Structures are given as structure tokens and as C-alpha cells.
RNA sequence: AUCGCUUCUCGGCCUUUUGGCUAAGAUCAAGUGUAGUAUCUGUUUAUCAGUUUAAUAUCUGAU
């Protein structure tokens, strides 16, 4: 599942990484894959 | 519906016969494969949970 | 001629945060659907 | 003095594609005077050909026509050569001609 | 109204600022149950009676 602190770091990574790189966003998060981010986000 | 449900998941583990290097998904793969030779009831609920309410 | 920067979704050479809305911004069905659905109802 | 020979053929294409494309406009139709920017065009020339290759829908809110025109020439350029150069290496491949290992994998990538 | 000084406000520059390329260059992440090791951290309750002991101590008992 999926908690506010995670999307919240998520928001974040992805305003700063921008949107192709989910395998380091996936990296900032403990217990996330690139493909649930990914999914999370679209 | 454990026999249609054993040839699935023994057709589903031929593909890693090897068990290579193989990654985190196919380790996540075969960790379902295994609870459902375990505890074959939950999931056949879920399948037909599955089958009867998801379209996406 | 002012030109606009480029703000890339695949290369953060500097690591900058850009907001979403600035990140993000740098469909048709035909009418025979209708008559082929319909047709197969009937 | 060295001559370009088989492993530096995609660094010098890309060295005087961006040679031209910074000759082309970005001196020879400017009026941008106070500083024409062309490092930063050069910026867009580079995502332009990402987001062909990505299949991506390129464009740029308020980007001179000039600059767009000059661009989207260059990337029908680029793209030439890239699609020719897949067809042939796909035909060496196929009769069997070259076993590298690393025409094999870039072929398969671009196809 | 004009000149100068100061205070705040606003506009304009703000390229003076995103090192090039390819097969997004390629790929991916598992765990604390057991012990132990090391480092810090703390230390070497007040009489008296007895037991004890080479002497201490210990032990026992009220504080």
C-alpha cells in the first residue's frame, strides 16, 4: 500500500528528476519498485 | 479446479528450470508461485475474484 | 527572437528542480464505431 | 591529423552535424543580436532527436519559426541516416556477414 | 515647478546559467534468527553481631 510520506517523497523526486528516470525515484523510496512508482504516478 | 490450478503453476515454473541470476520480478514470480502451491484456496479466490470484477 | 530554455525529461546535467506544471509542458474517434456497434446489437 | 575510421564514425557524425547546425542559423539567421543563444538551440536540437526517437510530439511554445524550421530539418537529416544505417546493418546481419557483438545488440535496439 | 540626498515600490537586462554521443550507454536492488567481537557507558551502604579467613573478603542478619 501506499502512504502519504511515500507519494509526498515521490511528488518531490519526480519534480526533481523529472518523469523518465523511475529506477532512481524507486531508489529514494524503501520498498518500492521503478514499476509501482511508475504506476502511482500515471 | 487444484488440478487445472496445479498444471498453471507447474507450467508457469518451467520457465525458470535453470533458477539463474534471474532478478527481483522473477523472485517476486516465483514467491507467488510458491504461496499458491502452498495455500491453494486463497488463491483460487482471488482468481475468481479476478475474473468477475476486473477490467483494467 | 527570444529563445526557450530547454528543460529535458531525460538529462538533469545541473540537478535543478523544475515544478510539474513547467516539467510537463515543452484524440480522435471516428463515427463508424456507432454504426458497427449498433449493427452488431441488432 | 587521424582519419575516421570504424569506431569513431557516430562521434564525428554528430561532431559536424552540430558544426553545420551552429554555422547554419545560429550565425547566418540570427538578429537575436546580444548573445544568439546558440548554445541553447544546440540544447534543442539534442531533445528534439530524443523525442523523435522516443516517438514523442516535439514542440516548443514560443520558439522562432526559423529556429523550428532549421531543427526539424536537421532531425529529417539525422533520422535519415540512423534508419539507413539499421537497414544495411540489418541485411549484414541477416546473410551473415559480421559477428560483432555489439552491431548485433545496437541493431536489435534500433529496430 | 526645478536641483540634490535619503527611504520604500516597480519595470527592463538578468545567454551571466543546464560538457558532446550510443543499445533511455547497460544493469539492479532481498535479509537481523543465533552467537560472539569491538567501542563506549557505569564501578572497585550507614554501623554493629556472628560465620569465616594469614589478613581481607564472603555469608548472614536491623537499620
Redesign the interface.
Known amino acids: 500500500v501506499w502512504r502519504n510520506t511515500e507519494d509526498e517523497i515521490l ?1 518531490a523526486a ?8 523511475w529506477s532512481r525515484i524507486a531508489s529514494l523510496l524503501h520498498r518500492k519498485s521503478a514499476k509501482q512508482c511508475k504506476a502511482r504516478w500515471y | 479446479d487444484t488440478k487445472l490450478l496445479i498444471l498453471a503453476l507447474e507450467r508457469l515454473k518451467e520457465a525458470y528450470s535453470v533458477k539463474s541470476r534471474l532478478n527481483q520480478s522473477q523472485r517476486e514470480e516465483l514467491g507467488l508461485i510458491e504461496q499458491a502451491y502452498d495455500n491453494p484456496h486463497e488463491a483460487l479466490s482471488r482468481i475468481k475474484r479476478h475474473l468477475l470484477t476486473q477490467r483494467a | ?6 528543460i ?3 538529462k ?1 546535467a545541473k ?6 506544471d513547467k ?4 484524440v480522435h474517434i471516428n463515427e463508424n464505431f456507432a454504426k458497427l456497434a449498433e449493427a452488431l446489437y441488432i | 591529423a587521424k582519419t575516421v575510421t570504424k569506431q569513431r564514425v557516430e562521434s564525428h557524425f554528430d561532431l559536424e552535424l552540430r558544426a553545420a547546425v551552429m554555422h547554419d542559423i545560429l550565425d547566418m539567421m ?3 543580436i546580444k548573445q544568439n ?1 546558440a548554445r ?2 544546440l ?2 536540437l539534442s ?1 528534439a532527436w ?1 523525442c523523435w526517437k522516443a516517438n514523442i510530439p516535439w514542440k ?5 519559426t526559423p ?1 523550428e524550421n532549421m531543427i526539424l530539418r536537421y532531425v529529417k537529416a539525422k533520422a535519415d541516416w540512423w534508419t539507413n544505417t539499421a537497414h544495411y546493418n540489418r541485411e549484414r546481419i541477416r546473410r551473415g556477414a559480421t559477428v560483432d557483438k555489439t552491431v548485433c545488440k545496437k541493431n536489435l535496439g534500433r529496430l
Open positions: 511528488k519526480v519534480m526533481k528528476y523529472g518523469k523518465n528516470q | 527572437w527570444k529563445i526557450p530554455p530547454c529535458s525529461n531525460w538533469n540537478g535543478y528542480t523544475i515544478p510539474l516539467r510537463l509542458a515543452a | 540570427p538578429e537575436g543563444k541553447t538551440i540544447q534543442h531533445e530524443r516548443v511554445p514560443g520558439l522562432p529556429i
